[PDB]
């Protein structure tokens, strides 16, 4: 079996190629005492006696020593396999520095002795999962609008937005506190749950605010120790920040950023408009697809055909796309083999994983 | 059990304040007396957290420091003023003793050199009279100066139930391996010993879990209650155990030991400890009393995770009598150079008894 490992800024997803879903998902954290190293859920569970590190906080690996520990954890603890016995497909963020790609390659072959490996861009895998090779795609925990044509991401048109799930969770804690409650402590986990369960994207912000101000029709209850609290306009005000970052003191929203299309050759822009795919946990808010449709339509030419694709399984579309790719007959010749690595070294990744 | 600490004079408050600063950091307690997030027994010294301290001009320096959220020169003047406020200062201690769960002792931090010399001698007499079952351990510090030095010695030889730290050996070690040439720099060295002296009362250990356990082991006879300290790292246990017996480290300016206690605060190997003691017996680096069977004790400990191998030595050495002769001899030279003045010779009489008591302790027939 080939392994598929999706390296996420907040959560890593791991499993076997061919499967419909990852076998394991865990926090991208490594902790050491304030057993010497803790990784994943355990690090989170015992965070009280540990100092936590986030080696891929914004999608890009910043500490390779701890990233190596996350991968060790992935193989031996989560999947219970020996990496030297299975090819490994890894995912990377859009605009990942070339040097990082070589580092990942060297670590897999030299540290884990993988028989074969490959690295693919997250957004590209999600597009594959939707059955397309062309389109524009990703909102996760700590961080993109990625135009893709014929399977190739267009780096010049890729845009990064340092606004994602983490920021939305903290913003919800802030407005719930302003409501009269008090969510300030690492309470952050509780609010993250409230966010994932009761939030939604309003089709029209002002109208929704007016409805919530004059009635209780949009209110939902949430039970903590038994205390039941009420969440009102906070339900949609929280994700509204994706469309209006100023609510967070940030100077463009996701609809406006999806600018990426305008940076592409005019001849493929219509293909992108007609194939705008959503992926990532932060795109799971109910109502987000219709809101994007409305907002993009307002920005694009009146004669443009706009279509937003929001797969029900988009939270794991990156991993699923990797499972699909690694299972393709034509992809087998694409793996970087240990032989090829020994022949050309780490830099082969640029040619093999273009 | 609990221990209430008393700080007298300028020397007491500073070395006491540096003692609490070192301990508050050892534990996960922020300077504003709030536990920080980041197993160590902290109920003996801290009251659920607030230190069980009784401080007695220098107070303003403590109140202006970031640690505000944590609470003449004649010996006769020091003894007189304590008599006038007897009920006042004894009202803050009574509630401090009563309010306590089950009081155990009265740690005292003072220097015998002006008001802490007298007011210290006064409280030492009242304490024993008020409570006869409470241990009084005094971290005295050695320096009209010869007079006040021996007067408190009269009180410290019958009242105090148990540690000398002499500034002369503090100055020598300062200039030797620390290169100071300062009060604020020597205090960093004494507080390192104090926080290490009670390292067996802040962590649940196998033995020495009570203050009466550290005392009754060393002190064989209630008159011979003066101890000295040794602290090497300023590696195996044999290296530490050998470096502690070097007179270059003993903080004291025939002769033999009565009992030694070694404190190892590291992660050392627990089986090699008996191997080191065996080689100590062969090379014969230490000599003991000939009359009674005396042994050496070594105890391990665990350093706080929030706050390497160290080592401290607590021993009851007969050479401590030499320090008293220096104080005794200087007095007689002043007695010929200038209401009744009879309190001095009584003190002079009783201190000479201890000196002869020491010199007779190193004989094969010390009994009777």
From Swiss-Prot, chain A:
Any GO molecular function: structural constituent of postsynaptic actin cytoskeleton
Result of changing residue 54 to A: Decreased interaction with SETD3
Cross-link (Microbial infection) Isoglutamyl lysine isopeptide (Glu-Lys) (interchain with K-50), where in sequence: 251
Principal subcellular localisation of the protein: cytoplasm
Reaction(s) catalysed by this chain's protein: ATP + H2O = ADP + phosphate + H(+)
Impact after mutating residue 66 to A: Decreased interaction with SETD3
Subcellular location: Cytoplasm, Cytoskeleton; Nucleus
Keywords: Acetylation, ATP-binding, Cytoplasm, Cytoskeleton, Deafness, Disease variant, Dystonia, Hydrolase, Intellectual disability, Isopeptide bond, Methylation, Nucleotide-binding, Nucleus, Oxidation, Ubl conjugation
Modified residues (N6-methyllysine): 69
Alphabetical list of InterPro entries matching this protein: Actin, Actin/actin-like_CS, Actin_CS, ATPase_NBD
EC number annotated for this UniProt entry: 3.6.4.-
PTM sites of type Tele-methylhistidine: 58
First-level EC class: hydrolase
Phenotype when changing residue 132 to C: In BNS and CSMH; also found in isolated non-syndromic Becker nevi; somatic variant
Mutagenesis or variant effect for residue 131 to S: In CSMH; somatic variant
UniProt effect for mutating residue 132 to S: In CSMH; also found in isolated non-syndromic Becker nevi; somatic variant
Phenotype for residue 58 to A: Abolished methylation by SETD3
Result, substituting residue 122 to H: In CSMH; uncertain significance; somatic variant
Consequence of changing residue 59 to A: Impaired methylation by SETD3
Domain of life: Eukaryota
Post-translational modification: ISGylated. MICAL1 and MICAL2 produce the (R)-S-oxide form. The (R)-S-oxide form is reverted by MSRB1 and MSRB2, which promote actin repolymerization.
Sites of the (Microbial infection) Isoglutamyl lysine isopeptide (Lys-Glu) (interchain with E-270) crosslink: 35
Disease: Dystonia-deafness syndrome 1: An autosomal dominant form of dystonia with juvenile onset, associated with congenital or childhood-onset sensorineural deafness. Dystonia is defined by the presence of sustained involuntary muscle contraction, often leading to abnormal postures. Some DDS1 patients have dysmorphic features, skeletal anomalies, and/or mild developmental delay with impaired intellectual development.
Other comment: In vertebrates 3 main groups of actin isoforms, alpha, beta and gamma have been identified. The alpha actins are found in muscle tissues and are a major constituent of the contractile apparatus. The beta and gamma actins coexist in most cell types as components of the cytoskeleton and as mediators of internal cell motility.
Name of the molecule in the record: Actin, cytoplasmic 1
Source organism per UniProt: Homo sapiens
Organism ancestry: Eukaryota, Metazoa, Chordata, Craniata, Vertebrata
Curated annotation (Swiss-Prot), chain B:
GO molecular function, one term: microtubule nucleator activity
Similarity comment: family membership: Belongs to the tubulin family.
Keyword Cell membrane in annotation: no
Subunit structure: Component of the gamma-tubulin ring complex (gTuRC) consisting of TUBGCP2, TUBGCP3, TUBGCP4, TUBGCP5 and TUBGCP6 and gamma-tubulin TUBG1 or TUBG2. TUBGCP2, TUBGCP3, TUBGCP4, TUBGCP5 and TUBGCP6 assemble in a 5:5:2:1:1 stoichiometry; each is associated with a gamma-tubulin, thereby arranging 14 gamma-tubulins in a helical manner. Gamma-tubulin at the first position is blocked by TUBGCP3 at the last position, allowing 13 protafilaments to grow into a microtubule.
Localization of this protein: Cytoplasm, Cytoskeleton, Microtubule organizing center, Centrosome; Cytoplasm, Cytoskeleton, Spindle
Keyword field: Cytoplasm, Cytoskeleton, Disease variant, GTP-binding, Lissencephaly, Microtubule, Nucleotide-binding, Phosphoprotein
Function of the protein: Tubulin is the major constituent of microtubules, protein filaments consisting of alpha- and beta-tubulin heterodimers. Gamma-tubulin is a key component of the gamma-tubulin ring complex (gTuRC) which mediates microtubule nucleation. The gTuRC regulates the minus-end nucleation of alpha-beta tubulin heterodimers that grow into microtubule protafilaments, a critical step in centrosome duplication and spindle formation.
Organism: Homo sapiens
Keyword Kinase: no
Protein name per UniProt: Tubulin gamma-1 chain
Gene: TUBG1
GO biological process: cytoplasmic microtubule organization; meiotic spindle organization; microtubule cytoskeleton organization; microtubule nucleation; mitotic cell cycle; mitotic sister chromatid segregation; mitotic spindle organization
Annotated positions of the Phosphoserine modification: 102
Chain sites annotated for binding GTP: 113-118
Related illness: Cortical dysplasia, complex, with other brain malformations 4: A disorder of aberrant neuronal migration and disturbed axonal guidance. Clinical features include early-onset seizures, microcephaly, spastic tetraplegia, and various malformations of cortical development, such as agyria, posterior or frontal pachygyria, thick cortex, and subcortical band heterotopia and thin corpus callosum in some patients.
């Amino acid at each position: 079996a080939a392994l598929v490992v999706d390296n996420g800024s907040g959560m890593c997803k791991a499993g076997f190629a061919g499967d419909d879903a990852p076998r394991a998902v865990f926090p991208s954290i490594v902790g050491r005492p304030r057993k010497d190293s803790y990784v994943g859920d355990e690090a989170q569970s015992k965070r009280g006696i540990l100092t936590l590190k986030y080696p891929i906080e914004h999608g890009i690996v910043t500490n390779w020593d701890d990233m190596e520990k996350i991968w060790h954890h992935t193989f031996y603890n989560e999947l219970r396999v020996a990496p030297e016995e299975h090819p490994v497909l890894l995912t990377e963020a859009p605009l990942n520095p070339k040097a990082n790609r070589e580092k990942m390659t060297q670590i897999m072959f030299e540290t884990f002795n993988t028989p074969a490996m490959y690295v693919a861009i997250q957004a590209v895998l999600s597009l594959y999962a939707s059955g397309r090779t062309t389109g524009i795609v990703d909102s996760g925990d700590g961080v993109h609008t990625v135009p893709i044509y014929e399977g190739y991401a267009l780096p010049h048109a890729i845009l990064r937005l340092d606004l994602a799930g983490r920021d939305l969770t903290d913003y919800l804690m802030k407005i719930l506190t302003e409501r009269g409650y008090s969510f300030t402590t690492t309470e952050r986990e509780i609010v993250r749950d409230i966010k994932e369960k009761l939030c939604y994207v309003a089709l029209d912000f002002e109208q929704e605010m007016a409805t919530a101000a004059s009635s209780s029709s949009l209110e939902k209850s949430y039970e903590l120790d038994g205390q039941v609290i009420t969440i009102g306009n906070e339900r949609f005000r929280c994700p509204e920040a994706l469309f209006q970052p100023s609510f967070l003191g940030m100077e463009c929203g996701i609809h406006e950023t999806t600018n990426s299309i305008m940076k592409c050759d005019v001849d493929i822009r219509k293909d992108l408009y007609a194939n705008t795919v959503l992926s990532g946990g932060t795109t799971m808010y109910p109502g987000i697809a219709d809101r994007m449709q409305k907002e993009i339509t307002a920005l694009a030419p009146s004669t443009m055909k706009i279509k937003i694709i929001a797969p029900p399984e988009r939270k794991y579309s990156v991993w699923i796309g990797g499972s699909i790719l690694a299972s393709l007959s034509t992809f087998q010749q694409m793996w970087i083999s240990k032989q090829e690595y020994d022949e050309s070294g780490p830099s082969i990744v640029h040619r093999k994983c273009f | 059990r609990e221990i209430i600490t008393l700080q007298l004079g300028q020397c007491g408050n500073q070395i006491g304040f540096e003692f609490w600063k070192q301990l508050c950091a050892e534990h996960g307690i922020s300077p504003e007396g709030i536990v920080e997030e980041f197993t160590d027994r902290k109920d003996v010294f801290f009251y659920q957290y607030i230190p069980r301290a009784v401080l007695l001009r220098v107070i303003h320096s403590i109140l202006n420091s970031p640690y505000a959220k944590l609470y003449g020169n004649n010996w006769a003047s020091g003894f007189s003023q304590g008599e006038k406020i007897h009920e006042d200062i004894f009202d803050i201690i009574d509630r401090e003793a009563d309010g306590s769960d089950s009081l155990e002792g009265f740690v005292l931090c003072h220097s015998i050199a002006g008001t802490g010399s007298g007011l210290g001698s006064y409280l030492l007499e009242r304490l024993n009279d008020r409570y006869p079952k409470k241990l009084v351990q005094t971290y005295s510090v050695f320096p009209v100066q010869p007079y006040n030095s021996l007067l408190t010695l009269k009180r410290l030889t019958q009242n105090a139930d148990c540690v000398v730290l002499d500034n002369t050996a503090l100055n020598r070690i300062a200039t030797d391996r620390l290169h100071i040439q300062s009060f604020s720099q020597i205090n960093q060295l004494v507080s390192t010993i104090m926080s290490a002296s009670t390292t067996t009362l802040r962590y649940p250990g196998y033995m020495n879990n009570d203050l009466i356990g550290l005392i009754a082991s060393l002190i064989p006879t209630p008159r011979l209650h003066f101890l000295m300290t040794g602290y090497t790292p300023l590696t195996t246990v044999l290296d530490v155990m050998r470096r502690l017996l070097q007179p270059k480290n003993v903080m004291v300016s025939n002769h033999c030991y009565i009992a030694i206690l070694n404190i190892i605060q590291g992660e050392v190997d627990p089986t090699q400890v008996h191997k080191s003691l065996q080689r100590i017996r062969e090379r014969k680096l230490a000599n003991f009393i000939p009359w009674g069977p005396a042994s050496i004790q070594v105890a391990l400990s665990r350093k706080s995770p929030y706050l390497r191998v160290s080592g401290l030595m607590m021993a009851n050495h007969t050479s401590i009598s030499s320090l008293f002769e220096r104080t005794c001899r200087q007095y007689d030279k002043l007695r010929k150079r200038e209401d009744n003045f009879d309190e001095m010779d009584t003190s002079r009489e009783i201190v000479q008894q201890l000196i002869d008591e020491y010199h007779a302790a190193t004989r094969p027939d010390y009994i009777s």
